Amino acid sequence: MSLATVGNNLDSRYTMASGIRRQINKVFPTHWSFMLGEIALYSFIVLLLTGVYLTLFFDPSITKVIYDGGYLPLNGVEMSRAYATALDISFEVRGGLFIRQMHHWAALLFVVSMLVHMLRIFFTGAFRRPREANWIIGVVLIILGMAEGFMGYSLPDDLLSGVGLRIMSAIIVGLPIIGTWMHWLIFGGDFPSDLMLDRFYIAHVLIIPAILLGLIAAHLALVWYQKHTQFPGAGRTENNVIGIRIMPLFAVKAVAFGLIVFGFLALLAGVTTINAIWNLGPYNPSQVSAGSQPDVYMLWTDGAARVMPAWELYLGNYTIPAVFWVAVMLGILVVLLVTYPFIERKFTGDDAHHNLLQRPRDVPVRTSLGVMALVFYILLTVSGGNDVYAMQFHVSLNAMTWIGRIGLIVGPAIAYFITYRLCIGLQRSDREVLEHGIETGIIKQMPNGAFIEVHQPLGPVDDHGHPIPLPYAGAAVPKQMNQLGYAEVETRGGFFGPDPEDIRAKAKEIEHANHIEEANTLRALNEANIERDK
Amino acid sequence: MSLATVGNNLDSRYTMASGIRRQINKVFPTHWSFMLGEIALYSFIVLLLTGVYLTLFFDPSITKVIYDGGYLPLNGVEMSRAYATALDISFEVRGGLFIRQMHHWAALLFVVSMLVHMLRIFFTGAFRRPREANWIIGVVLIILGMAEGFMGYSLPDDLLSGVGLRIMSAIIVGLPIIGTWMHWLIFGGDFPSDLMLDRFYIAHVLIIPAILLGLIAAHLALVWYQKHTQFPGAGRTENNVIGIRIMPLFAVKAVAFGLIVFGFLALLAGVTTINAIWNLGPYNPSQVSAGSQPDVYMLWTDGAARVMPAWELYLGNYTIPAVFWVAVMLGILVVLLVTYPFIERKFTGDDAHHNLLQRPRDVPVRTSLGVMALVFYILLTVSGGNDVYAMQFHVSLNAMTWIGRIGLIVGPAIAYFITYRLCIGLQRSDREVLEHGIETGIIKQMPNGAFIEVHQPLGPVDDHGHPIPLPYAGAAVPKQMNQLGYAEVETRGGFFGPDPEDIRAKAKEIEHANHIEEANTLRALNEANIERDK
Numbered sequence A, B: 001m002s003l004a005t006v007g008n009n010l011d012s013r014y015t016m017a018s019g020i021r022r023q024i025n026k027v028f029p030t031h032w033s034f035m036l037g038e039i040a041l042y043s044f045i046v047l048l049l050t051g052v053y054l055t056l057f058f059d060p061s062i063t064k065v066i067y068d069g070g071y072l073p074l075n076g077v078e079m080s081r082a083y084a085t086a087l088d089i090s091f092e093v094r095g096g097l098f099i100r101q102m103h104h105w106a107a108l109l110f111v112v113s114m115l116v117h118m119l120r121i122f123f124t125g126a127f128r129r130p131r132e133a134n135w136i137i138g139v140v141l142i143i144l145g146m147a148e149g150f151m152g153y154s155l156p157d158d159l160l161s162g163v164g165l166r167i168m169s170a171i172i173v174g175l176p177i178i179g180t181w182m183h184w185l186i187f188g189g190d191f192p193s194d195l196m197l198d199r200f201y202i203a204h205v206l207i208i209p210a211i212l213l214g215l216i217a218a219h220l221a222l223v224w225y226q227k228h229t230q231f232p233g234a235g236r237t238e239n240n241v242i243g244i245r246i247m248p249l250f251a252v253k254a255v256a257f258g259l260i261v262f263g264f265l266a267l268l269a270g271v272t273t274i275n276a277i278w279n280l281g282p283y284n285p286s287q288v289s290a291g292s293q294p295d296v297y298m299l300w301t302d303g304a305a306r307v308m309p310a311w312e313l314y315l316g317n318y319t320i321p322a323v324f325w326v327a328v329m330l331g332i333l334v335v336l337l338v339t340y341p342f343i344e345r346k347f348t349g350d351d352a353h354h355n356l357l358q359r360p361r362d363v364p365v366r367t368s369l370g371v372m373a374l375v376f377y378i379l380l381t382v383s384g385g386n387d388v389y390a391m392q393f394h395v396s397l398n399a400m401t402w403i404g405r406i407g408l409i410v411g412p413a414i415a416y417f418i419t420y421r422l423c424i425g426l427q428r429s430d431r432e433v434l435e436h437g438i439e440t441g442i443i444k445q446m447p448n449g450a451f452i453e454v455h456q457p458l459g460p461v462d463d464h465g466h467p468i469p470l471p472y473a474g475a476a477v478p479k480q481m482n483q484l485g486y487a488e489v490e491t492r493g494g495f496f497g498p499d500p501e502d503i504r505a506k507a508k509e510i511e512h513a514n515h516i517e518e519a520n521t522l523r524a525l526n527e528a529n530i531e532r533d534k
């Protein structure tokens, strides 16, 4: 076939035969955690493309028009050109509503996917040496992704977006030397300003996407260069990777998971409404709603402003407003996240070149601090949303603010305590299995009447008839007998009937032969590791 | 110093020591041609950054306002928001005029730098195998760079831009099935349309810059991967590169030439006016000027429309306008440029893996066709500008159109004839020197009265006392004696006086010793090439 001619013509010119061989043969581990990041990547792809489709219709201008579009309930209402063009996307373009909702849902999925991916990186310990650079890059990404998404939903100039813009401007003006100067620099004047929405539009469609794309490219390039970490397991060492090659069996799975995420987004974009701007009306600074919170990924920085106890300083001709302290708090919160691996180094007392991951149970301090930060962030989030929470679940609004205040101290401590003790209990169960074997659950009575539970050893048994303890290795310990194969089906066939018996027996024989062959190869690989380590 | 600690910390994590060594040791030839492309690259950098500064002030909206800005001569004039914000850049922002002019001059320098770089690639033969891909990429770049720049100067919605937009729309609507449909797709309706300037704005600031950046990145990456071509010379072969390493002596020169181009742009941006929009007035479809040509890089496609002899087809209920044929012509013109290396292959009868460049004199057909295309393009350009040409140089406007028409046939033929014969004469001079030696110009009279000119041989001399001819090698042949060193200064020192004589003599001795040492090393390298080729 002419495919060989194409390949020849390519390689005779570019000599890629050595390199692409090395690329296709790279090995990637197959844990389920290790494609959370791919979700964020796929969401970003969708964010790009749907965004580019929205720009052929959106007009980022704060100057007014008397609306005369397809949405009849606002004919004659004087509105910003931004809001009018967003409405024309929603109503006058075939399927523009579908697209706009997909863009928004993709933004939410992108941010939460980054959050969960970062949680995996934090708990499993993958940020450690040499990979802390990917942490410093990645934290910047999850900051900018929020910064972008915020100004992304600020653009339509509806009533719910402009209040968040008002909040941002009023926070900037309050800074204790340069606030007025920084505000006049950013907005080009007092708020609302003529040049405001175009600066934010270009910041949203060109600048921050360009930076995110560059940083994501560098991130993935670095992950590819220094190969992926892995969990401890049979035959795994600090100096090797066990998994599947990037093709055929991994690239197709990446394509398939891309398809799944893509289609999931296209479903939820048509089936759930998001940001129904047409019933919010255009922005004017005199109007506000009871539930006027920012997007979900910004609710934490709303909740901070809700829980600060109004401490304000007056110094003669000057004043530090009460909102400077939430800026300090949120900055400290961001600094701690940004610089984490080094404050981990200074107290952990090690600088080793780790390539194997820690199970979160085996590192109770870090996982306890992670759950502590999770409850802190969640209390900030729900305090941001407490207006809705109190309205729906009928808890007094003052009680919600005080729950946020006192909880941001107390609840983290309770989280740390419970998380630490639970982790210790988990690893105690692991040791109990490794030194006594699995508890099958089969209870038998001896002739003496003693009730005994037969335990099924994993390692060899002493001549007294009891297991010899194994050393814990960091790999997961099986805790039941269905996880050793002992509940697998003996019958073969589909629904409504069996396979013929000859096929049945031969298939089961081949299955068991493979099951012992893979055990043998992993066992020999582990023994080779022992020999090669001395 | 702590620099060593930084380097250690880096390489212990990323292991870049092998790779960056290989990068810094890459060799690049030093011909003056081989940084024309860098000019285009630097211009593109400037185009990006100055453009990003212009977007904090520009508002791409076709909806109107009564102007009240700093430019008093248009107070009260109702104008588009685009035009008003461009005026506010020019007059209300400190130094916005300086920036806007720099952006425009950078665009012109970018396009002409691409043109001259491509001319180098065409004449020297660098497009040949394996590098034709860089040709196919590069031609696309020099198309899109023009497409962008056109819509770049269309954005302000002034009177001179909107006429070009009118021309584009009226050409699109004339296509012989889909013209009306394609126009309604692109513009969102009839011209001028509400969504027009925002589609062009996003196409100008996001889409085409993103594509140009990606293609330029791929272009430079490919040039780096397969190493740069070189001219034939002493010690040069198809299998090696002779020049300087990318650092220290090349990277600093790249920085320095970047500085020179940058500062040149900053000078000419403040010293020459470009596109003085403030005296053109806002666009309205009923008004036009005598000199209303598009930008310079679009004048060719204007000139085509000027020289087409109005051939129009009528078919019952349908008509093919007279402007369809210029579309066909310009498309043929672009196709020929895009697909050139293969129509070079089919008639040249070779598919070899060339790495040494051809001097343009040695390939008279291709260089003659190149000058033929140059005169064709220049006649198209000046026909595009003939309204100005006839007004200034006092040649009748009809005579200019007929000069364009008949010249686009005749002048290419004359160019081919003259270019071919001149190239043959050049290489004849080269052979004459190589078989008779340099003509010094020293004329002496023999005792017989015969007037002789002493010739200075390059190669050995036969026992009859006359040079043995050398075979031509494609490298330049020296044609005078000042190019062999024989006019170099014997004195040393600055203005107003000499160096002391001891310093003088020692410096000259070292100079001549180095001059013979480099000759010896190149001679030995060439002999090694002969031995290694057999």
Ligand code: HEM
Pocket: A033, A034, A035, A036, A037, A038, A040, A041, A044, A114, A117, A118, A121, A126, A127, A131, A132, A134, A135, A136, A137, A138, A139, A141, A142, A216, A219, A223, A227, A228, A229, A230
């Ligand atoms: C849009 C943002 C991001 C994208 C597209 C992304 C993508 C990826 C992908 C695909 C992987 C490999 C597969 C996997 O680990 O699941 C990865 C690994 C990694 N990510 Fe991210 N990620 C993003 C954000 C972050 C954040 C927020 C952090 C941490 C603060 C981070 C730190 C890391 C590190 C250190 C690795 C390598 C860990 C290892 O090799 O085991 N990344 N990233």
Ligand code: HEM
Pocket: A047, A048, A049, A050, A051, A052, A054, A055, A058, A086, A089, A100, A101, A103, A104, A107, A110, A145, A146, A148, A149, A152, A153, A154, A155, A156, A204, A205, A206, A209, A275
């Ligand atoms: C090529 C990059 C992007 C482009 C061109 C783009 C374009 C746009 C445009 C024009 C709008 C306003 C028009 C409308 O409401 O439909 C918008 C809104 C929005 N953007 Fe983007 N965007 C891009 C990337 C992103 C990214 C990376 C995120 C998230 C981090 C994001 C999140 C949002 C959100 C949440 C909205 C509000 C949607 C709505 O209110 O309906 N966008 N985007």
Ligand code: HEM
Pocket: B033, B034, B035, B036, B037, B038, B040, B041, B044, B114, B117, B118, B121, B126, B127, B131, B132, B134, B135, B136, B137, B138, B139, B141, B142, B216, B219, B223, B227, B228, B229, B230
């Ligand atoms: C903005 C557009 C372009 C940029 C930034 C660019 C940049 C460069 C640079 C820096 C080089 C190496 C140094 C030099 O040759 O002077 C190069 C080489 C080259 N360029 Fe371009 N160029 C552009 C457009 C083009 C065009 C329009 C063509 C042809 C149609 C082209 C074809 C080539 C080829 C084939 C080479 C390699 C030739 C060799 O190795 O001798 N490029 N380019």
Ligand code: HEM
Pocket: B047, B048, B049, B050, B051, B052, B054, B055, B058, B086, B089, B100, B101, B103, B104, B107, B110, B145, B146, B148, B149, B152, B153, B154, B155, B156, B204, B205, B206, B209, B275
């Ligand atoms: C990041 C990429 C770019 C951005 C953000 C950008 C931005 C802009 C903006 C906003 C304008 C109109 C405002 C004004 O008149 O001052 C403009 C005009 C223009 N652009 Fe760009 N541009 C970019 C790249 C380019 C490129 C690559 C070219 C050339 C190929 C180009 C050529 C032009 C020209 C000729 C004008 C007209 C200038 C004038 O009329 O004063 N631009 N650009």
